[PDB]
Each structure stands twice: as structure tokens, then as C-alpha cells.
């Protein structure tokens, strides 16, 4: 039994990951979360995961912290196609985790890796003086934060990539 709480900016891909992991179902259309819980099971050692999905919105700053209680890890998520979400990770999310659960292990999770090869995303980033967050950059950001690991995937294109994130997360919590 392992409790993981997912936090990170709005639309960064948290609910998409949990829906793929727990429901085998990808949400093309964005539905803003308030809070939710999923249950998944996987083998690393059978492990039952209780997965807490939270809103990335400031609107819910007062209820989201109530989800951190007794969590084995926080999954700090960001959208590799939007570097502003890495800024939030280093600032808003780091600060919130440190305010509410400072001793809890943090895993840094990149979402939407498929968008690294998406022409229109690439063109948009270029017009914004930006680029997609790379894997190497994710690892560096994890080091800077004190996150235990950087992991990434694509809920949209790789169901197994999401399974592997949570298998690895489960293994880190059991050791």
C-alpha cells in the first residue's frame, strides 16, 4: 500500500496520466480537476497504489494541501511543452511542498514527451523564444530541487510509459 499525490500546474497532464494508468482511458478534452483518487495495482512484490489527483489551480490552494497527509511520495509534474510549468515547479510547487510536507520524498515527472516531435508545438515554442524541456534538463531540474528522481512519459502515445513511471515510483517508496 503506497500513497502518491500528484501536484503541478493546470493542464500539465496529471489527470491524463492517472486515467491512463488506472482506467485505460485517455482524456483528449481538458476537464479541470478539484481532487480525485484512483486505485491501481502493479508488480515490481505486489503493490496497491492510492493515487491522489489535485487541481493545479490557485483557486484550490486551500483544499489541495489536505491531500498531502501521510503520502509516501509527491509527484511534482510539469508539461515538457511549456517551460513556464518548470518555473512553477521551482517556485510555487517547491514552496508549497516545503510548507506542507517538507520531509516527503519528491519525484519530478515530465508529461507530454510526445510533443517534442510535434511540428506545431515546436513552431509555437520558437516564436516564444522557448523550446521543449529535454530529458537531460529534467534530470538537472530534479538535482536542483532535491527530487529523488526525474521520470517522464506520454499519456497520449504510450500507456506503458505511464505504467513504468508508477512502477519506478512504487519501487522508490518500498526502498
Amino acid at each position: 500500500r503506497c500513497k502518491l499525490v500528484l501536484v503541478g500546474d493546470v493542464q500539465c497532464g496529471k489527470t491524463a496520466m492517472l486515467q491512463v494508468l488506472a482506467k485505460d482511458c485517455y482524456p483528449e478534452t481538458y476537464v479541470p480537476t478539484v481532487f480525485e483518487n484512483y486505485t491501481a495495482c502493479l508488480e515490481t512484490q505486489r503493490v496497491e497504489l492510492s493515487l491522489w489527483d489535485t487541481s493545479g489551480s490557485p483557486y484550490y490552494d486551500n483544499v489541495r494541501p489536505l491531500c498531502y497527509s501521510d503520502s509516501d511520495a509527491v509527484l511534482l509534474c510539469f508539461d515538457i511543452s511549456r517551460p513556464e510549468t518548470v518555473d512553477s515547479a521551482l517556485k510555487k510547487w517547491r514552496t508549497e511542498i516545503l510548507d506542507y510536507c517538507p520531509s516527503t520524498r519528491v519525484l519530478l515527472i515530465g508529461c507530454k514527451t510526445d510533443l517534442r516531435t510535434d511540428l506545431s508545438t515546436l513552431m509555437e515554442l520558437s516564436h516564444q523564444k522557448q523550446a521543449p524541456i529535454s530529458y537531460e534538463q529534467g534530470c538537472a531540474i530534479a538535482k536542483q530541487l532535491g527530487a529523488e528522481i526525474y521520470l517522464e512519459g506520454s499519456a497520449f502515445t504510450s500507456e506503458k510509459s505511464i505504467h513504468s513511471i508508477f512502477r519506478t515510483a512504487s519501487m522508490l517508496c518500498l526502498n
Binding site: 481532487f35 491522489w52 483557486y59 494541501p65 506542507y100
Partner: protein
Amino acid sequence: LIRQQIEYKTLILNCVNPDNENSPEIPVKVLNCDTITQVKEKILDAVYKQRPRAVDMDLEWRQGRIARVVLQDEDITTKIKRLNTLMHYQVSDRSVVALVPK
């Protein structure tokens, strides 16, 4: 009569019937500026027309099948000392809530 900058409004909460979950929820009219204690009092008045007291119960905010969080007058989210209200937590109109024995 003047309206607030951040306005007060009535909300209906759908309270789970404590005797049987699969029964229809019980609608309870509350104010967004109600403290969690005042909310519990209103649910107890509506759901118990030997009654439990507000202090004997926790207010649970439910999402879907399993997810739930306990709301209280004071907790780690309180700004130092205003009592927490529904608007503090941003509880939406028609949210499913439950009263659970502490």
C-alpha cells in the same frame, strides 16, 4: 443595500443520507460565508428535524466514488484567526458532503 466585493451567496449541499448511501442525497441550504461549524449545525438541523452535535462530527467533502477530504474551522490551511468557511475551501454549489462521526 450594498453587495460585498466578494459576494455572499446561498449554496445547496447534497448531504449523503447516513442510514443508507444508495438513498438520494439530502439537500441542505447553506451560505458560502458559513464557517464549517455553522455548516454542520445546518446539516444536523435538516438531517435530524440525542442528536449528534456539530463538534461530534467531521464534514467530509466527497469527489466521485472514494476521494474525500475533511473540512474544519481550523486546520493547516487557516490564515492566522478567521474560521474556515465554504468559500475558503471553494466548496461548489451542489457538492456532495457527508457527516462522519469523529
